[PDB]
Amino acid sequence: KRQWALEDFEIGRPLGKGKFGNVYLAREKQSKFILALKVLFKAQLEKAGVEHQLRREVEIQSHLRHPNILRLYGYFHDATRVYLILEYAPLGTVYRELQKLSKFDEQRTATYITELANALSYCHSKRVIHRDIKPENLLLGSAGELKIADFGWSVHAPSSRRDTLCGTLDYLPPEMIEGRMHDEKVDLWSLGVLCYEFLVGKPPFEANTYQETYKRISRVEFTFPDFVTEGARDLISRLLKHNPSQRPMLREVLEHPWITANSSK
């Protein structure tokens, strides 16, 4: 019908639940194709005053096409709700996985990293920066792959409680936290932080007070545990630099010896 409706879909379990709403497992009635339906209340959108914000985000995310980015299939609204028709990721969140194994290895890590890197490079070229790449916003595709979800503000599968947030600043760069204008180089900060968590299992700036965390970020105080390969340290260290300018371009990352060394990709 050119325009979809709730009735065109069967609804499964909720995949995660957000503050604006939930993503449900779903399948289009006819083809029986399986997808993900993000539901957004717009009561909650009104409040936080992002609408025309969101309205231009759907515009871009539709035109985006990459293997490592979760695809936006289509969208509609009814009255009280907006509905994102999302590509479905079978394997769930890299956060779950990482929690399960408690840490990843260099082969796994390097590959995820190269994947993320192409993704952003893609985004960058499309004039999109600052994609929120913390683990809980990353999903795992059909077989092995890593997909950036991001977009519709975060949702959570039932799990811990610990952090609701509590989880926050760890992936934010000094410029961003400090309330200054930021270039495409923020997303390199993040890679640095993701990498670290991948090997360590915790992020580099984790602390038990927001202040102490903020302290370590800005002053860039982070230490590796004994086991981290020096080649790892190299990249990470190169990646977390208080100075945005001093942080690599995305290809330098894909060039990096340790990247190319342990990557499958």
Ligand SMILES: O=C(O)c1ccc(Nc2ncc(F)c(Nc3ccccc3Cl)n2)cc1
């Ligand atoms: O079993 C689980 O917990 C599970 C399994 C597969 C999933 N795949 C998926 N595909 C498309 C999405 F937009 C999506 N949203 C989502 C849900 C919870 C947490 C984070 C995200 Cl990005 N999630 C999501 C969750």
